[PDB]
A paper describes a structure:
One widely occurring ribonuclease with such multi-functional versatility is polynucleotide phosphorylase, a phosphorolytic exoribonuclease (PNPase; polyribonucleotide nucleotidyltransferase; EC 2.7.7.8).5,6 PNPase processively cleaves single-stranded RNA substrates in the 3′-to-5′ direction using inorganic phosphate to attack the phosphoester linkage at the 3′ terminus and liberate nucleoside diphosphate. E. coli PNPase core forms a homotrimer with a ring-like architecture that encloses a large central channel. The two RNase PH-like domains within each protomer are spatially related by a pseudo-dyad axis, so that the PNPase trimer has approximate dihedral symmetry D3. In the current study, we solved several crystal structures of E. coli PNPase core bound to its cognate RNase E micro-domain, including a complex with O2′-methyl-modified RNA bound and another with manganese in the active site.
Residue numbers in the entry:
A (entry chain D), F (entry chain F): 1039 to 1059
B (entry chain A): 2 to 545
C (entry chain B), D (entry chain C): 1 to 544
E (entry chain E): 1040 to 1059
The structure:
């Protein structure tokens, strides 16, 4: 019934980071 | 009426350069041919700059005449019209390497017109047109630090191939175009079937080495028939006015570039610029406004560049190899086949995937033969993505270019027709921009395709690398801001999966880029996309 | 991390979702609005600084439908959405018309609203959703804006009003009406009806205005939570001394100028007064703002005309409040056309033709809510010579598309169906003269042209525009308004229909505080006006 | 309202009707013209005051055909008339060309003429009707205009001249000529002929000029009854003190500049003279009008060139009055094209190609007089580099379409018919250099390109442009004119044909009082010119 | 022939207040 | 395969001249 980011069927997030070795 | 002619071997082909007989009223004009594929390239540079001009107006018009292939145009009016997406892309292939070679300060209007008048369906006119623009600009006398060469590199049987034919490209794992001077690489545009960092770097080096024969022959043609270089100088350094601007602005601009938030920083920078100009104009009303803005821009540039070289935290507090915060979402729109919202810092792309039939496949009436396209990629950049107002009409050239770049980043993982017999259309809507938006489109597409159930081999991601270089000292930057792109030395984009590189794009604004620098950039680019792919996996790791 | 601010509420038999805070954070404000699977992403960007010499408010509304919203790939040759269709232009006007008068007088900063349809339920029309989106985004932005507004479609099934009927329900409806307004007043009405009465049409406007209050209340609650601080904006302070100097030179002359009845004469004199007054004040003081003088002079014109209306004095052309201008009706004016008519009301004139055709000739509309073939075509042309001007003769303007559709809705109620008359019919209205309402002259002209072509319409159809001057509780409703009375008045109120009912009703109100009583005086006074026009039309032609 | 003023008269075998006073009363003037059911509604709007800093006469002619005139609905996807077709652009030029020189020298108020075809008899061409309409409206307007003009089509059936032949009669005609002029002289000629002689072509011009005098007489009578008062307009008063100041600084330098034969070098110097002269005068007195200084400088240029021609001195390039520039003819210049040619006459150059096709390639023309398939296509491109300039490279402009059709009419007479050579033939002329006549070079280049492609044309074809400098009774006819000699002269007089006759004749005369004798001298001198060019063309290729 | 003078049918009214 | 005027299969030229009367 709704669109937008709150409707995400899947979700993942990361804070600012330096990549692995 | 005598043509000056120069012929030379370039790989397996004979290249012919002709000047002096045709279009004698242009600043310079060259008829370039490579085994029956011929492109007539002209340049006109205006003697006087527009009195209030503050930006260099360079325009490249690339046009394909259908009589080149013994064809009459298929359109309703039976005449060539507005350039296709292909003609726009080739016009950009000519513009990108030549643009940084005009001296800083030079703002006379320059127009390059390339017209394809004959075509061998095995020899692509794009390389021929690039050589023509290099030759015409070098002959013109217009201040230009060329000549440049141009080379397409293939990868057949694990060997590099120079300017492969259309038939030979069908067996190639690589389609790469590299342009540059005698000293350095300036431009790279490529798509690859997940090749390694060493394989991609070797292709750039190979193509730059092979194209030296083109540069040498243009140099010899210029010695014969080149018009004398224009008597042009940049505006002399005004040391007293620089110090007056610095006394009002330097300390304020140094503090302004410690503000991390883009909107807060730009607002503050604008206040500093507005107040400095207003103060100086009250002391002296005859001071040139454009000049004051140029001195102000030089301070910003020096503040940001020097902090990078000194190893201090970047504008947003990051270290040289830190990636911005990520937000990955899938299934964001209710009626679309596949949707994704990809956010990296202050850059955001709303990406959708749509499935269709053979009826939905695009028919491309192209010069080298009619072709149908089953994979469509459109990239939209509205003015609100950067908090501005503007004309929303027809794709700009830049949109076309970034739409193609994102497509080349996804192409390597797309399933063929025997494994997924459907037409796929990917649309990327850039909702926020602060660098690289085309790479955000690559990630968003990978997520939207999986959401739609498209059976790609491997998730795909990308990033843009930056550079600050003075002499031998340089720093390579991961995931650059808009400010780090404009005040930096390059935009270096790499896309690919966990196993290799699908697309590599370089836009270098300086001469003197090095094999080592490109190697460091490619290696650091790898860790960056592996970090992004890891976050993308947490959300979705298989098609729906 | 990204955090959405979400408010959901029931609206009739639907759930409306409003999301802000996570998408397009660089725009002044951005909202994702959804009504049962139908979603529109709406953004607003308002520029902080007004342009140096700006004297008109630059507001642009762009409405665009993406085909991926319906799970389709665009049918065009390029497989990409291009220039806005006739339908997208009309919906852009539906958003623009109610929001324009709510920006404060004197506000001249550039404002752009972009609405993109990203998802669609084929039973839920995106136009109402997009209007709620523009209202919510403008209210959250902090840009000086006297909203929020609501939006409601009203149907009429089983002699009962229906809120936001589905596409399937409209097949049974005798009415398709859209109304937008604030908490206090109606601002915009767009409608077509199957010849309903004055009371039935008014009840629909009142019903839809009451129903949309839940939308206004929910935007208000979202604004108190997530709204950005209201801009610190002030109108330019009233300069009483400069007003007196302009009034001393111009008011007495402008008073006599607005008693000149002939349009061409009366401007020509108004322009002489303005030129001579400004040139005299600049001879006294060269530093005076020329734009500001034009605004004071325009304030005088407005006051001269408005106060004469309220005092009960004769109008500009000498008419009384409920008098219609002179009529001239002609039939069979062009020799080779299927049907032609020349309709003249005062200084407004329309040359209207009718053309019969076949299936082949019917228009195929590739709309987002479902493909539809159109049998009845109505095109409206407004060339610059109609008002004694020179200008472009390019493609149709947004105002030409809007008025062609309004005049079409005024005629559709009397058109024979396909069993009775199996032909494609095209009506073209050429506005040869203009001084108010030209789209209502197109309605009358079409009715005569259709009968002349032998099209068996149910009955003759006609229309007029009503005006208003209102101060506090005092008001006068004007019949058949001139261009001046539209521009200096408070509304444009258009009613079209036969002897037995109303086919189309359109309102464009420039003030807050319009009343049910006022709209009813207008509707009754409009009925008498069209019965008079029909009587003259009957004398010329009464049957095919 | 008052009825319209109507004047009828016999014009050949047709009845012409002129109506004014009732339709479009807000335009400066408006006329409905009819010729046996073919009706065109023509309006004129001339702006009261000229734009403060204007220095060119802005005259626009818009010709548009409505499909309801033929009882048809438009065949396009949107079922509406769009951008003007080639046919509409060509007819707009037929109206513009004779009226332009009749506006007084120095008159720079904006004038717009809009002609709309509202009714069509498939046997009576709307172009002549629209020309009569524009003449009637301009004469009725009161805008400073030295008309009225007439308009006539001349055919040649059974070796007799036929006035305004029908489309059916034209099937038997060896000639299709249109001539327009005042009572005194011819102003414009546009024609195609089946290789007719100089005497036959000159007779057609005189015949058509004599026959159209009844149209001129009737417009004069209508102006007597219904004409608006003549505009109170004056040219700028001559300033002799300023004339002498500019001449003291420039005349001697400009005299030397117009002895420089190289075009690029001459312009370069003319520009330096004008820049230095204006800067020197604005330093003495900064209140001097820069536009006026430019006009005095142009007057000195004009007088220097013109008086040297009349005195019998060598032309700008050193040529005598009847000398043709150096020629260079080339065939098979492009490898993959069916037929190619490079034709060089002086500083005018045309790269021309020929392409053979099938019935699929033949253009379908949705013309108002009837749908039609074109098997011969001629396109003409004039890029900005041809004259050493930068500029837009979009779509064809009004002149590119005009010269493309002129060159087509120069080649049409020698083309093989579909019965003997059943192929679609496309000719593209690329103007690489320009300084007098390009489009006659396109004729030569096409003849060579067609032979190179193996197209069995009946004979080789060529052309030239003739010039004129006339003062009172003294005149000199110039052969193969420079761009300067065209702009500073009194006519452009183009003739194309084989060794045995004239295929095309075009006149654009800028003065009144051109003579039958002068036109005869021009035609005879033009004959020797093309025989000379054809002789050199024969040395290269003399058969397919 | 075209224009308003060639009208097949025609009618006209002077400025008026309609009867309610 | 080269393009241009040095490639012309046929070639003819003349100096500036007054034609035969
Ligand atoms: N072949 C071809 N068709 C075109 C082109 N531009 C528009 N069209 C056609 O024009 C149609 C609309 O009329 C489109 O559906 C498309 O097929 C073009 O450049 N080439
Ligand atoms: N949707 C749609 N548009 C078409 C079609 N053919 C032509 N057009 C129109 O013609 C243009 C094609 O480019 C667009 O403006 C498009 O709207 C068609 O089959 N479908
Ligand atoms: N088939 C057809 N295409 C047309 C016609 N007129 C214009 N078009 C095409 O449709 C486009 C406008 O939509 C034009 O740019 C042109 O390509 C017509 O009469 N028939
Ligand atoms: Mg970047
Ligand atoms: Mg009105
Ligand atoms: Mg000429």
């Amino acid at each position: 019934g709704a669109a937008g980011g709150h409707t995400a069927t899947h979700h993942a997030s990361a804070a600012p980071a330096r990549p692995q070795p | 009426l005598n043509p000056i002619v120069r012929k030379f071997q370039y790989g397996q082909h004979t290249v012919t350069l002709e000047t002096g007989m045709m279009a004698r009223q242009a600043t310079a004009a060259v008829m370039v041919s490579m085994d029956d594929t011929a492109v007539f390239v002209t340049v006109v540079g205006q003697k006087k700059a527009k009195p209030g001009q503050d930006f260099f107006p360079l325009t490249v018009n690339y046009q394909e005449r259908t009589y080149a292939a013994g064809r009459i145009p298929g359109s309703f009016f039976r005449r060539e019209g507005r350039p296709s997406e292909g003609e726009t892309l080739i016009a950009r292939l000519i513009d990108r390497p030549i643009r940084p070679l005009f001296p800083e300060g030079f703002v006379n209007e320059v127009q390059v017109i390339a017209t394809v008048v004959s075509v061998n369906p095995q020899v692509n006119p794009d390389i021929v047109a690039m050589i023509g623009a290099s030759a015409a600009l070098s002959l013109s006398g217009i201040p230009f630090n060329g000549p440049i060469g141009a080379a397409r590199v293939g990868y057949i049987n694990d060997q590099y191939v120079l300017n492969p034919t259309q038939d030979e490209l069908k067996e190639s794992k690589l389609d790469l175009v590299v342009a540059g001077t005698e000293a350095a690489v300036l431009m790279v545009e490529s798509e690859a079937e997940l090749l390694s960092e060493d394989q991609m770097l070797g292709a750039v080096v190979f193509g730059h080495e092979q194209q030296q024969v083109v540069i040498q022959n243009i140099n010899e043609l210029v010695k014969e028939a080149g018009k004398p270089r224009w008597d042009w100088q940049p505006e002399p350094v005004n040391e007293a006015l620089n110090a007056r601007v610095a006394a009002l602005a330097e300390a304020r601009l140094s503090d302004a570039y410690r503000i991390t938030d883009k909107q807060e920083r730009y607002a503050q920078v604008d206040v500093i610029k507005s107040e400095t100009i207003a103060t100086l104009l009250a002391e002296d009303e005859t001071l040139d406004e454009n000049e004051l803005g140029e001195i102000l821009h030089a301070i910003e540039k020096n503040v940001v560049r020097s902090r990078v070289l000194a190893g201090e935290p970047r504008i947003d507090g990051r270290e040289k190899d830190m990636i911005r915060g990520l937000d990955v979402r899938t299934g964001v729109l209710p009626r679309t086949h596949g949707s994704a919202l990809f956010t990296r810092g202050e850059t955001q792309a709303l990406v959708t995937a749509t499935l269709g039939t053979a009826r939905d496949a695009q028919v491309l009436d192209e010069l080298m033969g009619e072709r149908t396209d089953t994979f469509l990629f459109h990239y939209n950049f509205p003015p609100y993505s950067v908090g501005e107002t503007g004309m929303v009409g027809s794709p700009k050239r830049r949109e076309i270019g970034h739409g193609r770049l994102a497509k080349r980043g996804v192409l390597a993982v797309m399933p063929d027709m025997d494994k997924f017999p459907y037409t796929v259309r990917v649309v990327s809507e850039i909702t926020e921009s602060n660098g690289s938006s085309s790479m955000a489109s690559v990630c968003g597409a990978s997520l939207a395709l999986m959401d739609a159930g498209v059976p790609i081999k491997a998730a795909v991601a990308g990033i843009a690398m930056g550079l600050v270089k003075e002499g031998d000292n340089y720093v390579v930057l991961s995931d650059i801001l808009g400010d780090e792109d404009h005040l930096g030395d390059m935009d270096f984009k790499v896309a690919g999966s966990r196993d290799g590189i699908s697309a590599l794009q370089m836009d270098i604004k300086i001469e003197g880029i090095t094999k080592e620098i490109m190697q460091v950039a490619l290696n650091q680019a790898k860790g960056a996309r592996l970090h992004i792919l890891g976050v993308m996996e947490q959300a979705i790791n298989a098609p729906r």
